[PDB]
Design a protein around this ligand. Structure first.
Ligand SMILES: [Cl-]
Ligand SMILES: [Cl-]
Length: 272
């Protein structure tokens, strides 16, 4: 059936994982029958700003390879004026797809994923990137590890079928930090990613993001910035987890906990 050549290396297409804006992802095999994911981007009719954002995303992905194995591997790539191919490490399943099909998450699993997420995001912060759009879909489960897939630089959407890609009703403000919303009139910092990570852990803890129940988007944004609107933190066995969540979801980012401090938190450091 179909092949893709990248830097002269031939890859046969096992299957298509999804589509995007003008994008496709495929599971492929090399000549030794080792599996990879190839992202294809059609550059035809794409503007400098999008090109530049992909160029910049690739440069960062490329550079940060060496710094953390909680970043998706970029084995190789090919860029012309007409297209991009990126040869990347293939995963098992994204975190959102995984969480959506899980009844309840094992406490140990949750903690372990939490550590992976902190480390990946810590890495990008150390190279001056604030992602600013973190959600479960930005993480891929690989060998039982979470790996960050993108840096929020590229104007890309993670792979899905035709109906989802053309669905105007996807794109949540459920993970959006208060300081971004008050920005609207640079409030965004590494603390913004802490809030979003906090919403992911909260989800993995209580089965919903903090404001998921507010269905009107404008109402939801109103609740996110409203200090008087209390976030519920139901008592749970893991008191360290409960604390983490309270520390990540402080509306004032100066009061909000940082990543280096999350990495020294009991929830992360003390076992059983
Ligand atoms: Cl895309
Ligand atoms: Cl629990």
């Amino acid at each position: 059936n179909e092949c893709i050549s990248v830097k002269g290396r031939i890859y046969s297409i096992l299957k298509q994982i999804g589509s995007g804006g003008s994008s496709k992802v495929f599971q492929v095999l090399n000549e030794k029958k080792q599996i990879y994911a190839i992202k294809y981007v059609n550059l035809e009719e794409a503007d400098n700003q999008t090109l530049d954002s992909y160029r910049n995303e690739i440069a960062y992905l490329n550079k940060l390879q060496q710094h953390s194995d909680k970043i998706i591997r970029l084995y190789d790539y090919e860029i012309t004026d007409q297209y991009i191919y990126m040869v990347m490490e293939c995963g098992n399943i994204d975190l959102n797809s995984w969480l959506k099909k899980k009844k309840s998450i094992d406490p140990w699993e949750r903690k372990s994923y939490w550590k992976n997420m902190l480390e990946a995001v810590h890495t990008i912060h150390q190279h001056g990137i604030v992602h600013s759009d973190l959600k479960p879909a930005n993480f891929l489960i690989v060998d039982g590890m979470l790996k960050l897939i993108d840096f929020g630089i590229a104007n890309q959407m993670q792979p899905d079928t035709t109906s989802v890609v053309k669905d105007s009703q996807v794109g949540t403000v459920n993970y959006m930090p208060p300081e971004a919303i008050k920005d609207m009139s640079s409030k965004i910092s590494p603390k913004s990613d802490v809030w979003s990570l906090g919403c992911i852990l909260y989800y993995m803890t209580y089965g919903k993001t903090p404001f998921q129940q507010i269905i009107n988007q404008i109402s939801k944004l109103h609740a996110i910035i409203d200090p008087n609107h209390e976030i519920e933190f139901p008592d749970i066995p893991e008191k360290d987890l409960q604390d983490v969540l309270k520390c990540c979801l402080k509306r004032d980012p100066k009061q909000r906990i940082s990543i280096p401090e999350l990495l020294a938190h009991p929830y992360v450091q003390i076992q059983t």
